[PDB]
């Protein structure tokens, strides 16, 4: 129950067993902090949150003091003024005079709480000088400047608890206690860059970002990450033409103040291999074209080919937004094609789960549902390389509760413990018939999670009926008034939204019709068998990569940091990006390109504006008009039809499940063009813990340094 205390004269209620600092954020009372973070364990080390409490001889650490029945707390007394002034004097006594050369300046808690809570002048002038410690090499991503450390312990708590990376620590004792790894070794965690933001000071900073920007000259845009299927909420920091860095922002339902390194550190690939002009293939060379003489060249080819039903084919990639798929579905439909493929392997044939009921292809227990999960079965997915910040939530629930995890598929190095039940459908069949099925049966909030790798497999037909049959057998556990045990995990931002509007091959009759005109709508990981050699290929996208280099005509579209596009994440949350910058060169918005060519091809699309297309969108599925929320699947039990009734006789092959993410750093066009990810992969290949590994800086073997970054 919520107990009642008074803080600064005002009354506040809060659940018992809360920290007193927590009762302060409820009572609208500002309390200074360095070591305390809402998402970490309480450490008690900084001494900046000391407040006055009755019947208490000495100031109490508000972060570590349990709220009592009827305490009276003073956060503004002479005791608190004297403590905050004195602790600021201690934290600033061996702190380096490096505020001009530090990348935390203008965004520093130590200068903002020194200005608000400390004296204006220092009394520290010792002839002995300040403490100086040596710098450290913890990989290619995190530049070190350890004189700045104030010993808050936020990065060691994050690395050990949140991320499951127990390599960072604090060796030593006294004033010589030093954060780092004992041995000079790389930090191997996809959540690594999160210690840069957690760091109160700039001792742990970003190597790619070093010295480039100041925070006051940065425009702040609240957008969505599209580099995986979770739709992590991000803050995009731009200085005019150029994106400078990607920060996480709070969404406890989705990402929980964390982003992974690829979401974070691949933004430098937004400026490197871009498409800015239409190119028409002439005599085996790509020559520039005007937009008119590119759409005309497309229209002429389509007229010459005369594609009948389903000889027009469209493949959509990981980063496509719903304003493009709904616009492309309307273009192909009026051209006579229902052949609407997807970029993954097996993305050009009917899918094992259909798209009639949304609960077939979603994460039906929410991402927030893992917060309650008691038993989780994993089917053919590496939650680290697919949804890195969702993998952390599983670990968080696991450490603090009796959560049991087992998995079917390829073994993976994991941040949590799990039982490997096998690699194929025969193993999964024993898994449910065996102890983990009984564990799944006996548990409250049971959770089966199917990865999109299964949907790519030969036996997705058979895998998906096996799982759902277990679910339907076990409702009132799996299908209750408030619970959905069935989950499908998506690793690409475009795919749930593609399912939302039917952008999927309907029948093998459609899939068996060889196309002669193929539009690759941002598609770059397409299987070579899904693209005919003699088809007229049109590539639309923002990067010159595998898709653009095999096409006859390329059309420059927008990237996600320059469009306002809808994306649906793996659980069916509908989110919109916000443009951080304008369009480069002569690039267009993708749904305008599709609408523009509908003029040239003879079938113009009714809408001429984004609102008219978002009205079209909302009558394909009305959930697309409800942003930031997840709609409940009304007819949940109708998922039996496409999952079991439609998947009964399957030629099971027994081929084991695959590892669909070979390289975490390279998963799409933006990542494959990022210099920072190129250094992450290369350092991970050889283990070089050095900060300047393929970056500017002096080294012992590099006396003169280099201007090259990423080489």
């Amino acid at each position: 129950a919520e107990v009642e205390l008074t803080i600064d004269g005002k009354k506040v209620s809060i659940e018992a067993g809360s920290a007193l600092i927590q009762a302060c954020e409820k009572a609208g009372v500002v309390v200074p902090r360095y070591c305390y973070h809402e998402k970490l364990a309480i450490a008690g080390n900084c001494r900046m949150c000391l407040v006055e409490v009755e019947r208490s001889p000495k100031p109490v650490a508000s972060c570590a003091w349990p709220v009592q029945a009827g305490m009276v707390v003073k956060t503004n007394s002479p005791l608190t003024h004297k403590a905050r002034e004195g602790v600021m004097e201690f934290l600033l006594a061996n702190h380096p005079l490096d505020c001009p050369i530090c990348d935390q300046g203008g965004e520093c808690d130590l200068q903002d709480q020194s200005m608000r809570y400390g004296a204006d002048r220092g009394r520290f002038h010792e002839i002995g000088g300040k403490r100086a410690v040596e710098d450290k090499n913890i990989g290619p991503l995190i530049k070190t400047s350890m004189n700045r450390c104030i010993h808050c312990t936020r990065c060691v708590r994050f690395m050990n608890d949140i991320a499951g990376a127990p390599e960072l620590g604090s060796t030593g004792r006294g004033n010589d206690l030093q954060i780092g790894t004992y041995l000079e070794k790389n930090l191997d965690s996809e959540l690594s860059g999160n210690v840069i933001d957690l760091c109160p000071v700039g001792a742990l900073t970003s190597k790619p970002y070093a010295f480039r920007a100041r925070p006051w000259e940065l425009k702040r845009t609240e957008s969505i990450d599209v580099l995986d299927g979770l739709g992590s909420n991000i803050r995009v920091d731009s200085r005019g033409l150029e994106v400078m860095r990607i920060l996480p922002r709070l969404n406890d339902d989705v990402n929980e103040e964390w982003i992974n390194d690829k979401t974070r550190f691949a933004c430098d690939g937004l400026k490197t291999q871009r498409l800015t002009m239409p190119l028409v293939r002439r005599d085996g060379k790509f020559e520039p074209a005007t937009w008119e003489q590119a759409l005309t060249e497309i229209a002429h080819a389509y007229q010459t080919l005369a594609p009948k039903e389903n000889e027009f084919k469209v493949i959509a990639g990981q980063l496509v937004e719903v304003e493009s798929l709904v616009a492309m579905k309307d273009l192909a439909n009026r051209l006579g094609s229902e052949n609407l493929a997807l970029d993954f392997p097996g993305g050009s044939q009917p899918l094992a789960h259909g798209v009639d009921i949304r609960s077939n292809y979603l994460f039906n227990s929410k991402i927030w549902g893992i917060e309650e999960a008691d038993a989780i079965l994993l089917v053919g997915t590496n939650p680290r390389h697919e949804a890195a910040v969702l993998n952390a939530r599983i670990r968080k629930q696991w450490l603090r509760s009796d959560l049991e995890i087992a998995a079917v598929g390829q073994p993976w190095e994991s941040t949590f413990d799990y039982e490997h039940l096998g690699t194929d459908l025969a193993a999964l069949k024993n898994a449910l018939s065996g102890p983990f099925g009984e564990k799944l049966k006996k548990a409250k909030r049971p959770m089966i999670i199917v990865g999109s790798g299964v949907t790519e497999h030969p036996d997705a037909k058979a895998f998906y009926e096996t799982v759902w049959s277990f679910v339907e057998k076990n409702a009132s556990n799996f299908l209750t008034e408030e619970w959905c045990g069935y989950n499908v995990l998506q690793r690409a931002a475009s795919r749930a939204g593609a399912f939302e509007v039917g952008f999927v091959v309907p029948s093998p009759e459609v899939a068996a019709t060889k196309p002669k005109f193929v539009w690759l709508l941002g598609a770059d990981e397409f299987d070579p068998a899904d693209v005919p050699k003699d088809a007229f290929i049109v590539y639309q996208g923002h990067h010159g990569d595998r898709g653009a280099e095999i096409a006859d005509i390329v059309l420059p579209g927008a990237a996600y940091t320059e469009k306002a596009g809808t994306y649906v994440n793996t659980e069916g949350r509908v989110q919109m990006t916000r443009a951080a910058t304008g369009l480069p060169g002569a690039a267009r918005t993708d749904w305008k390109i599709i609408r523009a060519v509908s003029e040239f091809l003879g079938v113009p699309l009714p809408y001429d504006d984004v609102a008219q297309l978002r009205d079209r969108m909302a009558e394909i599925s009305p959930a697309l008009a409800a942003y930031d929320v997840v709609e409940p699947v009304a007819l949940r039990h109708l998922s039996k039809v496409q999952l079991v009734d439609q998947n009964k006789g399957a030629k099971v092959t027994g081929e084991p499940l695959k590892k669909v993410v070979e390289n975490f750093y390279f998963t799409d066009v933006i990542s494959r063009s990022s210099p920072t990810m190129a250094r992450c992969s290369a350092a991970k290949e050889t283990g070089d813990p050095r900060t300047n590994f393929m970056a500017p800086g002096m080294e012992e073997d590099r006396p003169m340094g280099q201007i090259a970054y990423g080489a």
Partner: protein
């Protein structure tokens, strides 16, 4: 708001609350000689409302490209022969949006804007902005800063009056006093350029004191100048005070009564010329003024001649104040000793951590001014200069409005000038002492 869409109760207006004068004691149809048949509608046959909208008086654009315009004024004059029937001053030709630009600046970043309003009185303009922010900051600037600001406040007053009085004499035709007095002001801009690094836009007086301390030879050189400045006042006194052409160009010209001068928003000499004893440094003492003795020149006829005699007396009173400041200059800091407000010494910023953090935050974010609003006014050399500053509680002002004395004075131009000749308009522009950096802002 919503009710205004359709017809509702009419908002009451000054015409409604008009009252009829009592006929027992009313004497005369015009107690003012300003409206005594020296305006429009004193000739012709019909009024200019109907059947008269087809004709014009002789209308001449007096400025902007005009010497007597002293800059950037477009004074549209309607002449009946060589007599002014209507004067319409058109301003905004030096309007540069200073008050909007101040809203995208920190409080430090906005202070150089005040240098450029009355741009012969830079350090006085700086003071009124520095005293408004200091009031909203609830801080007390040290005694040495208060004595530097009053001494350079009166050095500024002399600099303005040299430009004002001798520009005014130049317009009436006297050339030589202008040349003599511009050596003295050329002398006094050394004192500016020695404490600041600028002859004109010092950026010296700032919220919290002054930017730097005066150099070690400055007080002796100011006193050396002071021992001869009396003779300078007397030789310009020697060409104009008794000159019979000076007396007949200014005596009886631009006459404003005491009760109308207040109603016209007149301040300074424009008000004190009419016989009112009023000085903002006497009535609301600021800085070190309540620590010095000075007299207040007050005229009795409210004309260009009395205003000239009051300004030539303020030369002598400013030099009198300056001497006392030199004598009473205390030791101590020239900046409030709080590094959360004023920048720390460069030595301290390079030596100590809390000094570096404070230097870094004061030059990027600025200091935060506690929320509220204030009207602060000082006796500027041209009148009551005021500022209305609204504070968010953040580091940028929400609103900075400058109350410029010459804006209030140029508005009463047609009131006092209609009926005089074209030369008398030139006489009234110079006695009213306009600088259009403050008029337009």
């Amino acid at each position: 708001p919503q009710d205004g869409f359709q017809g509702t109760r009419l908002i009451p207006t000054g015409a409604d609350f008009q009252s009829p004068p009592d006929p027992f004691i009313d004497e005369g149809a015009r107690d003012n000689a300003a409206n005594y048949g020296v305006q429009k509608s004193r000739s012709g046959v019909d009024e200019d409302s109907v059947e008269g909208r087809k004709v014009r008086h002789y209308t001449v654009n007096f400025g902007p490209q005009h010497p007597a315009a002293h800059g950037v004024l477009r004074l549209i004059l309607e002449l009946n022969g060589e007599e002014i029937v209507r004067a319409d001053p058109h301003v905004g030709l030096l309007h540069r949006g200073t008050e909007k630009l101040c809203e995208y600046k920190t409080y430090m970043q906005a202070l150089p804007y005040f240098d450029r309003l009355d741009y012969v009185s830079m350090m006085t303009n700086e003071q009124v902005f520095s005293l408004a922010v200091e009031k909203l900051l609830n801080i007390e600037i040290p005694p040495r800063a208060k004595f530097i600001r009053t001494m350079f406040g009166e050095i500024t007053r002399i600099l303005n009056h040299l430009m004002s009085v001798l520009s005014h004499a130049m317009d009436v035709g006297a050339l030589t006093p202008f040349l003599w007095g511009f050596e003295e002001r050329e002398k006094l801009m050394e004192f500016y350029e020695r404490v600041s690094g600028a002859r004109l836009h010092a950026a010296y007086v700032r919220p919290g004191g002054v930017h730097q301390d005066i150099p070690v030879g400055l007080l002796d050189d100011i006193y050396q100048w002071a021992t001869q400045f009396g003779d300078r006042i007397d030789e310009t006194e020697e060409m104009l005070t008794d000159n019979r052409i000076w007396i007949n160009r200014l005596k009886g010209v631009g006459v404003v009564s005491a009760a109308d001068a207040l109603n016209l928003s007149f301040t300074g000499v424009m008000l004190r010329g009419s016989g009112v004893p009023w000085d903002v440094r006497k009535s609301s003492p600021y800085d070190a003024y309540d620590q010095v003795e000075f007299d207040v020149p007050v005229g009795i006829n409210g004309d260009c001649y009395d205003r000239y005699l009051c300004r030539m007396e303020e030369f002598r009173q400013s030099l009198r104040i300056i001497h006392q400041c030199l004598n009473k200059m205390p030791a101590g800091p020239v900046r409030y000793e709080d590094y959360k407000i004023t920048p720390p010494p460069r030595a301290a910023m390079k030596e100590n951590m809390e000094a570096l953090i404070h230097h870094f935050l004061l030059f990027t974010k600025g200091y935060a001014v506690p929320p509220g609003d204030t009207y602060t006014a000082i006796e500027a050399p041209k009148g009551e200069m005021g500022v209305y500053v609204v504070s968010d509680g953040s580091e940028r002002p929400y609103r900075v409005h400058i109350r410029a004395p010459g804006f209030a004075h140029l508005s009463g131009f047609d009131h006092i000038t209609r009926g005089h000749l074209l030369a008398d308009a030139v006489a009234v522009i110079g006695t009213m002492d306009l600088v259009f950096g403050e008029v337009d802002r």
